[PDB]
Design a protein around this ligand. Structure first.
Ligand SMILES: *[C@@H]1O[C@H](CO)[C@@H](O[C@@H]2O[C@H](CO)[C@@H](O)[C@H](O)[C@H]2NC(C)=O)[C@H](O)[C@H]1NC(C)=O
Ligand code: NAG
Ligand code: NAG
Ligand code: NAG
Ligand code: NAG
Ligand code: NAG
Ligand code: ZN
Lengths: 195, 596
């Protein structure tokens, strides 16, 4: 009776910036999915490929937990076949995605009166991200045709920008914590079954 | 990568940095306006300075993208607005001179005081001191003293400044490729590159003068009826054929004739509709008022107020210790944060104001999804027009009876109908010749058509001829009477109040037709009409993204300002005035003056 480390992922003190989203590989444990409803009416729980409706009678090879913080408006981009700064430049789900997206408002933790600049996101990139790719590069984005020489200036922008979370923002601009459960099925013995 | 793609990327970075920095300044400004301390002043100025300095840096950076090489109009609008923001067209010395002048004129206006003859220690400011006299006093001499003292001791101070103010404002505007500073102001209505919706700056003058001609008959009979009623109250002071003395018009300038209602009321035995007693009877508070105003907008299909609105707004006076700036204002700080600052009392007037200010909030929320630089009314007259039409419906007996504030046993008759329209006309119609004639004078001064030695000469020739108002004391060129009004000495354009007035009745006529309103336009209530709300919303969500001519067409079906709905709204009064003036002289002689 080995219990899967979900309290590690969900109840973490500080989530990762979405550009540097955090992945926790899960294996060799009993996954108690049916007990995840312990948040402030967690505003989202939508699954793709599998059913959340008590379909934890199923076994998977490995389960990957991906966690990050975005604003309420951007949660619609954590889904297959979406576009936007997040889905194009920070965290991209594939068209054939099989898993679940969990999100809840974390204004009480991730907002601050002076503005919480801890959480960043990527604003510029030469191209979109492949599914489940991660880019943490801090190289100056060359928007013009002159080289940038590694410093910010005209047509040369630092590719990352900050969310500046304040508690008085509207709901669309408030911080939301997201956990993306990616279910894997390889030609190998299932190590993760959850009764 | 093209220059248009470089501009799109630049605007992307600007939109993020500006949204955060603007929020810091708005919040810091809010914390002062609701809790007046010395530290909150410093935080407001520090946050304001950072925002101003960010706007100056980004204005310069935006100009390094030349507009002629962008095709996307939505991008060019944003680029142009940021470029047209910087004043880095005048040398640092002339920029510095001009800001000092602006500060000195603003300081003179706000701290200008007048001390009663015979005591140097009894001294009054304009607000509330002189404003109280001009709005309540019936004594001819007291009003003449306040009127003249304000212009001769504060106005004369502003004359040498305004002269230098015109020169520098023209230099700045000419170097931005405008004919003059008046042409610069008319730039707010310009539209280019959209076939069928373009509008030139000089077209505004023609449309204002064309629409004003159709207003003259209504204004002449309003002016004729007012002069007759005042002549009864001041038989030795007013000529039956002359202009109205400037100090007997209800405020310091005669901008609004609202306070003449007591002396001009058509039927003084029928009481006005005042629901203040019924609000207190039902133990209404401020939250009930705004809750009702929210219900109004929900009834037409618009969204309810955000949760952040109710938590963060200040709807009641803070208290004795905590001091506030109680001027009612709607705040769009960005990032979903919308608030109203308002020291609400349980009165009918504040009840209507709540609908007016929440009308602004609805506009702000509707275009919040537009780019930062396009989050505004379609032009300078749109935003205020939206606010006004909400208080038109909210105040009708139909709307008041449906919310339980007016008794069902109260029925309208054409006498209270006429009393209402006259009171409305005193405010709405009376300000139109005042507003047109003030801006025309400034347009001509900036154009160079009025020499310095004939400033006050032409000012009173235009007051007499256009407004039918005559100065009670001769004024030479040591005076600067136009500058004795806030907007003139505080560098604000003024024609917006004229265009807004015309827009607001075009809006209301259109929305009431969508509401299938039967009867005179002034009795209409758009409540419960989702088709009306949809028509309005299709313009609100546009912001500045579309030409103001197109945005207007979305609501009213016409591409241009029109004065027929305004005349439609006042038609019952117009016919009643003409029948009242059947044995009166209509029009005025400009040669008569009270100083003989
Ligand atoms: C440049 O843009 C700023 C944006 O805020 C303008 O500043 C505002 O101007 C209006 C009207 O003049 C005032 O009511 C606001 O209070 C101003 N805000 C600030 C910064 O205090 C500014 O007017 C623009 N400059 C021009 C005319 O190009
Ligand atoms: C997080 O903590 C709460 C309360 O301690 C608990 O109910 C919840 O199950 C925890 N989350 C997970 C994923 O275990
Ligand atoms: C008003 O501002 C002061 C700082 O100057 C602050 O200490 C105080 O708590 C504020 N009061 C309220 C009610 O916000
Ligand atoms: C202009 O740019 C915006 C944003 O990139 C785009 O959505 C719009 O379609 C463009 N319009 C034209 C005419 O290219
Ligand atoms: C606004 O209306 C929506 C439903 O239309 C509702 O879910 C929401 O709770 C309402 N908000 C408030 C503050 O009542
Ligand atoms: C009100 O309307 C009736 C219509 O027959 C008219 O006779 C009456 O004179 C009007 N009263 C006033 C005060 O206008
Ligand atoms: Zn307003």
């Amino acid at each position: 009776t080995n219990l899967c480390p979900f309290d590690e992922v969900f109840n973490a003190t500080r989530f990762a910036s979405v550009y540097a989203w955090n992945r926790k590989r899960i294996s060799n444990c009993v996954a108690d999915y049916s007990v995840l409803y312990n948040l402030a009416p967690f505003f989202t729980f939508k699954c793709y490929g599998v059913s959340p409706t008590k379909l934890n009678d199923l076994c998977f090879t490995n389960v990957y937990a991906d966690s990050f913080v975005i604003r309420g408006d951007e949660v619609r981009q954590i889904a297959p076949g979406q576009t936007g700064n997040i889905a194009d430049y920070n965290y991209k789900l594939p068209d054939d995605f099989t898993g679940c997206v969990i999100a809840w408002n974390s204004n009480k933790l991730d907002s601050k009166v002076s503005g919480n600049y801890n959480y960043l996101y990527r604003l510029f990139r030469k191209s979109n991200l492949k599914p489940f790719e991660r880019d943490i590069s801090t190289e100056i984005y060359q928007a013009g045709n002159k080289p940038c020489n590694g410093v910010a200036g005209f047509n040369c922008y630092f590719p990352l920008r900050s969310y500046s979370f304040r508690p008085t923002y509207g709901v669309g601009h408030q911080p939301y914590r997201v956990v993306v459960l990616s279910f894997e099925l390889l030609h190998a013995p299932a190590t993760v079954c959850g009764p | 990568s093209t220059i248009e793609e470089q501009a799109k990327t630049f605007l992307d970075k600007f939109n993020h940095e500006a949204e955060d920095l603007f929020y810091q300044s708005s919040l810091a400004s809010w914390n002062y306006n609701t809790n007046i301390t010395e530290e909150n002043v410093q935080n407001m100025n520090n946050a304001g300075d950072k925002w101003s300095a960010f706007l100056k840096e980004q204005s310069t950076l935006a100009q390094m993208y030349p507009l002629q090489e962008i095709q996307n109009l939505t991008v060019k609008l944003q680029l142009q607005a940021l470029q047209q923001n910087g004043s880095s067209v005048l040398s640092e010395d002339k920029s510095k001179r001009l800001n000092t002048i602006l500060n000195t004129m603003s300081t003179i206006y706000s701290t200008g005081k007048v001390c009663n003859p015979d005591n140097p220690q009894e001294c009054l400011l304009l607000e509330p001191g002189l404003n109280e006299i001009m709005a309540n006093s019936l004594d001819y001499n007291e009003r003449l003293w306040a009127w003249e003292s304000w212009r001769s001791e504060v106005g004369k101070q502003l004359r040498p400044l305004y002269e230098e103010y015109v020169v520098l404002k023209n230099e700045m505007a000419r170097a931005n490729h405008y004919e003059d500073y008046g042409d610069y102001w008319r730039g707010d209505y310009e539209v280019n590159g959209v076939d069928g919706y373009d509008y030139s700056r000089g077209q505004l003058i023609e449309d204002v003068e064309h629409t004003f001609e159709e207003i003259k008959p209504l204004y002449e009979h309003l002016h004729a009826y007012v002069r007759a009623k005042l002549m009864n109250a001041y038989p030795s002071y007013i000529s039956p054929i002359g202009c109205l003395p400037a100090h007997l018009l209800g405020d310091m300038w005669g901008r609004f004739w609202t306070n003449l209602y007591s002396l001009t009321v058509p039927f003084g035995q029928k009481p006005n509709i005042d629901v203040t007693d019924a609000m207190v009877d039902q133990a209404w508070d401020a939250q009930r008022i705004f809750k009702e105003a929210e219900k109004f907008f929900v009834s037409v299909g618009l969204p309810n107020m955000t949760q952040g609105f109710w938590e963060n707004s200040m709807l009641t006076d803070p208290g004795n210790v905590q001091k506030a700036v109680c001027h009612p204002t709607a705040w769009d700080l960005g990032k979903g944060d919308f608030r109203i600052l308002m020291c609400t009392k349980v009165t009918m007037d504040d009840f209507l104001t709540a609908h007016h200010e929440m009308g602004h909030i609805q506009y702000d929320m509707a275009y919040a999804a537009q780019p930062f630089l396009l989050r505004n009314g379609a032009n300078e007259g749109f935003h205020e027009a939206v606010g006004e039409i909400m208080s038109l419906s909210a105040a009708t007996p139909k709307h008041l009876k449906s919310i339980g504030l007016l008794s069902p046993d109260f029925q309208e008759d054409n006498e209270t109908e006429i009393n209402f329209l006259l009171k409305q006309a005193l405010t709405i119609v009376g300000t139109l010749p005042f507003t047109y004639m003030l801006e025309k004078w400034r347009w001509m001064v900036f154009k160079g058509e009025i020499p310095k030695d004939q400033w006050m000469k032409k000012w009173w020739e235009m007051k007499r001829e256009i407004v039918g108002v005559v100065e009670p004391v001769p004024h030479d060129e040591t005076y600067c009477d136009p500058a004795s009004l806030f907007h003139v000495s505080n560098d604000y354009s003024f024609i917006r109040y004229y265009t807004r007035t015309l827009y607001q009745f075009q809006f209301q006529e259109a929305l009431c037709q969508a509401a299938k309103h039967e009867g005179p336009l002034h009795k209409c209530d758009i409540s419960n009409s989702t088709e009306a709300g949809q028509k309005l919303f299709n313009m609100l969500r546009l912001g500045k993204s579309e030409p103001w001519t197109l945005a207007l067409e979305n609501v009213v079906g016409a591409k241009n300002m029109n004065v027929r709905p305004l005349l439609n709204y006042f038609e019952p009064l117009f016919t009643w005035l003409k029948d009242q003036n059947k044995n009166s002289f209509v029009g005025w002689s400009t040669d008569w003056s009270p100083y003989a």
